[PDB]
C-alpha cells in the first residue's frame, strides 16, 4: 500500500481544512455587522417574520 500516484490522505485532509476555513469566514461577517440572518442561507422563515416586525 505504498503508492506515488494518489494521496487519499491529502484528499481527506484538504476537505477538513476547507470546512474549517468556511466556518471561520462566516463567523467574522456575523460579528462585523451584528446580524445572524445576513443572507437567505440562514432561517428562511426568520427573515420573512422580521420583515413584518420591521414594518
Amino acid at each position: 500500500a505504498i503508492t506515488v500516484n494518489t494521496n487519499v490522505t491529502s484528499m481527506k485532509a484538504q476537505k477538513n481544512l476547507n470546512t474549517s476555513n468556511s466556518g471561520l469566514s462566516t463567523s467574522m461577517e456575523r460579528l462585523s455587522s451584528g446580524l445572524r440572518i445576513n443572507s437567505a442561507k440562514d432561517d428562511a422563515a426568520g427573515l420573512a417574520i422580521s420583515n413584518r416586525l420591521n414594518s
Partner: protein, 54 residues
Amino acid sequence: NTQANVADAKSRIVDVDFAKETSAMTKYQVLQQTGSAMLAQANQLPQVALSLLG
C-alpha cells in the same frame, strides 16, 4: 410600550449573541492551524518510496 416589546421579539431572531459567536470564532481558529499542520505533514508521506532505492 408596544414598540419596545416588538424590538425585543425582533432582536431574538436576527441578532447575534457575541458569547455564542466569539466561542465559535476561536473554536475554528485552532482547527485551522491543526488542519494546516496535518496537511503539510501528510503531503510528504510519499517520500518513503525514495528510501527503498528510488
